[PDB]
């Protein structure tokens, strides 16, 4: 009862980890265009 | 509907990219930079507090006779006597001013982030406010 | 005769050996 | 002066723990760059006139030059004209060089 | 004493500019002595993180302010474009820095700095500073003489 | 949409399409991000400079050239 | 990795 | 105006899908961490001082337990009130992006209205 | 084992969480450096 | 619909227009440093332009009086 209903909320709150893992590959990109001007 | 929207809407973008972003990196930083200061005299108050209890605590006790002092101490035994729990509120009473120190310290120093959620938000609602009804006003003119 | 003060020694791992022999001779 | 007494790698090292205590709190890749005494001090002791041995002239050339003429030929034979080395990106067109 | 900011472009300001201001009075003293009082004055003002003209506003000065400023424009022009000047002057401070939504009395709001200030001018309208009925014209002119020269706690009680 | 290239042409092919078209959003937001500071940084230093005119620092005028490229065959 | 979607990025990347 | 109002909503939503706001988050933390274990190195110190202080050291004693033990309560009265005046100044600080994401939620539909009325 | 295998990936997530989490903002911070070195 | 050819055409459509946006990005932000620089050069050229201007207004006022 309480492991079950407030663990499957959880995995809502997990589902924007790949929202931050998918924004911190495009900081690279963006840290890659100021290197690149930087040189 | 290209109704010279152009000169009142990058008068917004000049307010919404110099404020709205900018702020947030202020008081961030405002409310890191106070917490470093939580740490320096946090530390300090480790470093004299911990030079006392290795100054008394060596000075007492690496002599023989102020070390038995202790030895005999208030004695391990029970009934206090009328004297050794005089002892015992005393140290109950120097426990609970030093907490006390330390939770003011924390109240007027919890002051410093609570009290920058006030003012510098608010201007960004008021200036916000004017540039979108001018937008409006603009709006019913064609 | 105000006091003394103190006296200081030259450590080791400070010191420096900076000279052109250093890494060269002549004959 | 550091030439004179030769104290090079006195002042070398010296140099280099100031600079990099300076900018410390910076992030470890941009050392070099958001220095300031860093990156001038090694231009002018490994190439200015007054400073580099002649031997080690030759050792810079020989390992340039056939990267630097390859870099030539690439412009003669596609017929790279002034202006497109200087509006395109230099990776796109010195590859086989680089 | 008033004061006016010329400061044409934003960025005249010196770093973090704290407003230097002196005054220097050079008064005689009944014990046979001249002399020369000087206080010096730093208001840090206007930093680009917006507000911090507004949150050093105190509402019992300004009130004061435009109390002085109100009795001697009717010294010089009628009291009727006074009233309406001056009226004009409370309607901007509150469509400006008043906490609501336009066109939504009921989401009004006020700062705790500007919040007495307009019962601070429902009382200076209905004093005898500015209307000068129900008194005799000595009645009037010895409260404007008292007015001018009273301190800033000794005022708003007026 | 990719829902339907998702069906039919495969899972991976959809995040390829994916992270390709957000790549061209999120660099088309911060190049306007400097696009609308090279407007207020213009306009900035044309009206600071009129104070000046009502042996200047500055370099003003033609800079070094980078690259500039161009879409094949769009515009 | 950081998603090398060009030529010139698997050239000066490798 | 109309690709003007769609960098509207594209230089809002920077600022609201970044998880940037997440990170300083997490860095605040961390320091908020060690510091209440370095408040609790204060805490057995400052008792273990207090402790060997009032070892050495040296009216009626019936009636010297009496301030001693009244500064009791009243130590018990003074950290009870301000640790609920902290409690109070934990929520007003937690009031941080619960309400600066609500000035940008505002922020966008109003502007969303006018963009869905200019597509129209 | 259902549930055995939920908490077993909320163990490896919240880490990966916590790692792409502190070096983001190493590139955050990059950025602005980068900036300031090409100022 | 979109089908076979017009999926690789999509896709180097997309593959070009990132190239463009990198180099486009690339000069814009040498272009945004080297005008903030231009205005905060002509910022401090002013400001030390009206201290000197004041400063010599005043010390007109000294020498009057």
Redesign the interface.
């Known amino acids: 009862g309480d492991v079950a209903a407030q663990l499957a909320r959880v995995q809502r709150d997990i589902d924007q980890h790949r929202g931050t893992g998918?924004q911190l590959?495009?900081t690279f990109?963006?840290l890659r265009?100021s290197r690149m001007s930087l040189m | 509907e290209h109704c010279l929207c152009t000169e009142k809407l990058?008068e917004l973008?000049?307010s919404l990219?110099?404020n709205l972003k900018s702020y947030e990196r202020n008081v961030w930083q405002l409310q890191v930079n106070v917490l470093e200061d939580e740490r320096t005299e946090l530390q300090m108050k480790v470093a004299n507090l911990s030079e006392r209890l290795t100054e008394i605590q060596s000075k007492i006790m690496n002599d023989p006779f102020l070390s038995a002092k202790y030895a005999a101490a208030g004695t391990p035994g029970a009934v206090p006597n009328a004297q050794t729990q005089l002892r015992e509120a005393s140290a109950r009473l120097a426990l609970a001013e030093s907490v006390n120190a330390e939770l003011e310290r924390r109240l007027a120093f919890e002051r410093s982030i609570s009290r920058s959620w006030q003012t510098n938000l608010r201007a960004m609602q008021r200036e916000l406010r004017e540039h979108l009804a001018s937008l409006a006003l603009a709006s019913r003119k064609s | 005769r105000p006091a003394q003060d103190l006296n200081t020694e030259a450590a080791a791992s400070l010191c420096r050996v900076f000279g052109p022999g250093l890494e060269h001779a002549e004959a | 002066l550091a030439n004179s007494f030769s104290a090079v790698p006195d002042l070398a090292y010296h140099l280099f723990r100031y600079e990099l205590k300076w900018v410390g709190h910076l992030p470890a890749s941009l050392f070099l760059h958001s220095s300031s005494l860093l990156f001038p001090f090694l231009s002018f002791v490994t190439s200015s006139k007054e400073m580099l041995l002649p031997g080690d002239l030759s050792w810079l050339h020989q390992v340039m030059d056939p990267v630097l003429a390859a870099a030539d030929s690439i412009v003669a034979s596609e017929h790279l004209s002034a202006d497109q080395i200087?509006?395109?990106?230099?990776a796109k067109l010195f590859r086989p060089a680089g | 004493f008033y004061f006016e900011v010329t400061n044409?472009?934003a960025?005249n300001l010196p770093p973090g500019k704290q407003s230097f201001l002196q005054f220097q009075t050079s008064y005689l003293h009944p014990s046979g002595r001249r002399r020369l009082r000087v206080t010096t004055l730093s208001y840090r003002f206007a930093e680009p993180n917006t507000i911090d003209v507004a949150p050093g506003f105190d509402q019992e000065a300004a009130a004061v302010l435009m109390t002085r400023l109100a009795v001697f424009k009717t010294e010089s022009e009628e009291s009727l474009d006074v009233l309406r000047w001056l009226d004009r002057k409370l309607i901007r401070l509150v469509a400006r820095f008043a906490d609501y939504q336009k066109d939504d009395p009921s989401s009004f709001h006020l700062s705790t700095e500007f919040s007495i200030y307009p019962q601070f001018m429902y009382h200076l309208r209905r004093s005898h500073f500015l209307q000068t009925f129900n008194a005799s014209p000595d009645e009037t002119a010895y409260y404007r003489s008292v007015l001018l020269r009273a301190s800033v706690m000794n005022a708003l009680v007026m | 949409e990719t829902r339907?290239?998702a069906r039919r042409?495969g899972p991976e092919?959809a995040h390829?399409?994916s992270?390709?078209?957000?790549?061209?959003?999120?660099?088309?937001?911060?190049?306007?991000?400097?696009?609308?500071?090279?407007?207020?940084?213009?306009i900035?230093?044309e009206?600071?400079?009129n104070?000046?005119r009502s042996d200047?620092?500055?370099?003003?005028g033609e800079?070094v050239?980078?690259?500039?490229?161009?879409?094949?065959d769009?515009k | 990795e950081a998603?090398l979607?060009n030529v010139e990025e698997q050239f000066l990347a490798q």
Do not use: C, H
Request: aromatic residues 6%; neutral net charge; glycine residues 2%.
């Open positions: 998918k590959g495009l990109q963006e265009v | 990058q973008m000049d990219d110099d | 200087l509006r395109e990106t230099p | 044409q472009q960025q | 339907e290239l042409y092919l390829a399409f992270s390709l078209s957000d790549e061209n959003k999120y660099l088309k937001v911060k190049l306007q991000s400097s696009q609308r500071a090279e407007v207020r940084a213009e900035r230093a009206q600071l400079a104070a000046l200047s620092p500055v370099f003003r800079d050239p980078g690259p500039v490229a161009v879409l094949r769009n | 998603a979607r």
